[PDB]
Design a protein around this ligand. Structure first.
Ligand SMILES: Nc1ncnc2c1ncn2[C@@H]1O[C@H](COP(=O)(O)OP(=O)(O)OP(=O)(O)O)[C@@H](O)[C@H]1O
Ligand SMILES: C/C1=C/C(=O)O[C@@H]2C[C@@H](CC[C@H](C)/C=C\CC1)O[C@@](O)([C@@H]1CSC(=O)N1)C2
Ligand SMILES: [Ca+2]
Lengths: 20, 347
C-alpha cells in the first residue's frame, strides 16, 4: 500500500475526536 | 504540534484544532470591522475568494482573535470550493507561507472533507452552504472535475426568497437586519415537503402546518406554505427565476458524467453536507427524487447525519490529525524551493 492508500484506509477506519 | 483547521465559508468561517470534534470558532465571513466585531463586505462570494485583502483580515482575526494562536506555530489545513481556480490556490498558499509564516499547510476540497467525515473515500456529496451548492463525485479522495456541478443558489438566496414571499404578504423585509430576522425564521421553521403539490393543498385546507413568529417590534407573523416553498427553490430554481435544474437533477447529471463503473457506488453513498442541507425532510425528498431518476434496481442511500452543518470542518479535523496524513503537508521548506505552484503537486 502506497502512503496515499494507507491514508484512505485510515479515513475509512475513522477515529474518536476530542469533545470541545 | 496541534494542526489548525479553517473552513472558509461564504457565510461562516468554521475554525479550530485538528483532533477536536467541532470548531471552536464559528463567526461571519465579513468585514466592516472583522467577523463578530465601514456596509458589510463578504470576501468569499459563492465559495471563491474575491477580496484578498479582506480575506487576509479574516485569517488574521481567526488566528489571533478567535483561536488565540500564532500561525507560525501550527500546520494549517484550509478548505476550498470544488473547481477553485489554480491561481486562487496559489494565492492562498503564498499568503499562508509568506504573510502568516505557517510551518506547513494543506488545502482540501470542502465536499471531499465531508465525505471523509462520513468514513468514506468514494461517493457523491451535495454540499450546500450560504453562497453556493455543489454536486461532487469523488473516487478515492479525488473530486472528479469534469463531473462537478455548481449552482449559485444556497442558503442566502433562500433567505432572500423567503423575504420576498413574506414582503408580498405585506411584511416588508429588505434591510441587513431584516435579512437576519428572516434567516432565523428560515432556520427555525422551514422544511422540505415530500410532495410539494400535496403539501400546497394541506397548507390551504387546514391551519395544521402553521407556525407563528414574533418579530422585534412585537408584531407576530404567521407562516404556512412559506415554510416549504422557501426551500422548495432548491428543487425548483425557477422560483427565483433561475433556469438551472434543481439539485436532484444536478445530482443525476453529475452521476452521469462519471463512468458507469462507479455509478453504483455513487448512488449508494450520497452524502449531504452544509447548513442548507439542514431542512427537515430534505434527505427523504432527495431519496424520492433520485429513486425516480435512477435505474429501477439501483440501490440509493442518502447519508445526512445530524452534525452535517459542520461535517466539512469535522472531516478536516480528522484528516489533519491522522498519523498517515503527516507526510502530506506542504512544508515551508518545500514552498521556499518550489514557490506557490507546490500546491498543485501536493493538494
Ligand atoms: N437549521 C438550518 N436550516 C436551514 N438552513 C440553515 C440551518 N442552519 C444553517 N442554515 C443556513 O446555512 C448557511 C450557513 O451554512 P454553512 O456554514 O454550511 O455555509 P458556508 O460554508 O459559509 O457557505 P458556502 O460553503 O456556500 O461558501 C446559512 O444560509 C444558514 O442560514
Ligand atoms: C448567526 C449567523 C449565521 C449565519 O449564517 O451568518 C452568515 C453570515 C452573515 C453575515 C451578516 C451578519 C449580520 C452576521 C452574523 C450572523 C451570523 O450573513 C448571513 O446571515 C446571510 C445574510 S442572510 C443569510 O441567509 N445569509 C450568513
Ligand atoms: Ca461551506
Amino acid at each position: 500500500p502506497s502512503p496515499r492508500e494507507q491514508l484512505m484506509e485510515s479515513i475509512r477506519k475513522g477515529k474518536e475526536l476530542k469533545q470541545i | 504540534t496541534t494542526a489548525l483547521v479553517c473552513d472558509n465559508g461564504s457565510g461562516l468561517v468554521k475554525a479550530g484544532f485538528a483532533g477536536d470534534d467541532a470548531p471552536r470558532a464559528v463567526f461571519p465571513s465579513i468585514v466592516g470591522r472583522v467577523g463578530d466585531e465601514r456596509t458589510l463586505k463578504y470576501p468569499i462570494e459563492h465559495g471563491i475568494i474575491t477580496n484578498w485583502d479582506d480575506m487576509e483580515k479574516i485569517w488574521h482575526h481567526t488566528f489571533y482573535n478567535e483561536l488565540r494562536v500564532a500561525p507560525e506555530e501550527h500546520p494549517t489545513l484550509l478548505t476550498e470550493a470544488p473547481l477553485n481556480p489554480k491561481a486562487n490556490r496559489e494565492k492562498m498558499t503564498q499568503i499562508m507561507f509568506e504573510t502568516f509564516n505557517v510551518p506547513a499547510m494543506y488545502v482540501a476540497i470542502q465536499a471531499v472533507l465531508s465525505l471523509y467525515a462520513s468514513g468514506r473515500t468514494t461517493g457523491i456529496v451535495l454540499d450546500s452552504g450560504d453562497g453556493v451548492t455543489h454536486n461532487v463525485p469523488i473516487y478515492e479522495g479525488y473530486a472528479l472535475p469534469h463531473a462537478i456541478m455548481r449552482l449559485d443558489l444556497a442558503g442566502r438566496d433562500l433567505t432572500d426568497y423567503l423575504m420576498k414571499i413574506l414582503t408580498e404578504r405585506g411584511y416588508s423585509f429588505v434591510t441587513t437586519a431584516e435579512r437576519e430576522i428572516v434567516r432565523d425564521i428560515k432556520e427555525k421553521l422551514c422544511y422540505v415537503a415530500l410532495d410539494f403539490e400535496n403539501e400546497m393543498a394541506t397548507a390551504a385546507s387546514s391551519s395544521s402546518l402553521e407556525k407563528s413568529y414574533e418579530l422585534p417590534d412585537g408584531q407576530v407573523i404567521t407562516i404556512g406554505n412559506e415554510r416549504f416553498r422557501c426551500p422548495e427553490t432548491l428543487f425548483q430554481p425557477s422560483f427565483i427565476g433561475m433556469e438551472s435544474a434543481g439539485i436532484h437533477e444536478t445530482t443525476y447529471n453529475s452521476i452521469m458524467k462519471c463512468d458507469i463503473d462507479i455509478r453504483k457506488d455513487l448512488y449508494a453513498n450520497n452524502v449531504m453536507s452544509g447548513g442548507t442541507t439542514m431542512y427537515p425532510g430534505i434527505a427523504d425528498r432527495m431519496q424520492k427524487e433520485i429513486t425516480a431518476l435512477a435505474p429501477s434496481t439501483m440501490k440509493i442511500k442518502i447519508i445526512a447525519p445530524p452534525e452535517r452543518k459542520y461535517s466539512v470542518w469535522i472531516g478536516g479535523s480528522i484528516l489533519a490529525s491522522l498519523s498517515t496524513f503527516q507526510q502530506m503537508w506542504i512544508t515551508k521548506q518545500e514552498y521556499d524551493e518550489a514557490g506557490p505552484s507546490i500546491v498543485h503537486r501536493k493538494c
